[PDB]
Amino acid sequence: KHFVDPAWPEHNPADGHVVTELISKVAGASSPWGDDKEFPVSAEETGYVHPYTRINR
Amino acid sequence: PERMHYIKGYVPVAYSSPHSSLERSATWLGMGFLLTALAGVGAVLFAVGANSVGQQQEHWVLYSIIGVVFAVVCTVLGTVLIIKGRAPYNRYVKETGRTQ
């Protein structure tokens, strides 16, 4: 069988399809980060690290 | 979806309902041919008008006849196709008893 990128959303072809040249499950463009995601997420789950910093006086 | 539901005393705007005539391709194609038909009227007028001042003497009968032929085929085509596109609306009007 063919390979599938794990970022690909799961679906059952027997009752639909994921995307074609003609139709899609969205009115606008699909999310670059995956329509299957659910934003927002937690601060630590973001991976960002806010810097505390001070400067001389 | 799949069916409408109106209570008594409610009148909607009829357009783009599943029974509407604007939603089907025959109607629009008929509009195109109906617009095309007036070109034949122009053609026959051009033929007889050129005749009125003694010009186009060698071909004016052919131009008039072909103009009338094109006009009649186009206008009858447009009318028939429009009526075909409106047939679902007539069936709906028979079904429900509401015009809009």
């Binding site: 003609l22 606008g28 | 979806p1 799949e2 357009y15 629009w28 095309t36």
Partner: protein
């Protein structure tokens, strides 16, 4: 997308009929104050204008036979029907201005016809287009 897929059939058939009428007319009518003979400019334009509208109409119809009964087209739809994700939209981007400037540089290059301006313009143009298309997929800073 049912109504707009099918309303395009009027303009295209009218343009096609005008194209054939005009080709026969100019190739046959030897009227004074004009010269007999088929003219290709105008006839080609009419047929390919019919082509443009026919391409639009046929693609839209070919697509619309696939789609479902969308709530925007349902004459008695409720605001709750379309709840969910509408889609992804670009928040902001500097690259449209950049590639407009690149096209401007290329256009000025062909104005004076300095070959280096044309080459640098094309290079800058494909660079800016690439940066536009990769905006929301540039990799995270690799440590």
């Amino acid at each position: 997308m049912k109504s707009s897929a099918k309303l395009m059939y009027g303009p295209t058939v009218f343009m096609a009929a005008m194209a054939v009428i005009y080709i026969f007319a100019t190739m046959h009518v030897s009227d004074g104050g004009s010269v007999k003979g088929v003219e290709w400019v105008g006839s080609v334009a009419l047929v390919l204008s019919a082509g443009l509208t026919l391409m639009l109409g046929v693609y839209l119809h070919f697509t619309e036979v696939r789609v479902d009964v969308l709530p925007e087209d349902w004459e008695e739809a409720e605001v709750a029907d379309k709840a969910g994700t509408l889609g992804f939209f670009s928040p902001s981007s500097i690259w449209p201005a950049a590639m407009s400037g690149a096209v401007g540089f290329l256009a000025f290059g062909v104005v004076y016809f300095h070959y280096w301006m044309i080459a640098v313009g094309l290079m800058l143009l494909i660079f800016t287009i690439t940066k536009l298309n990769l905006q929301y997929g540039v990799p995270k800073e690799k440590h």
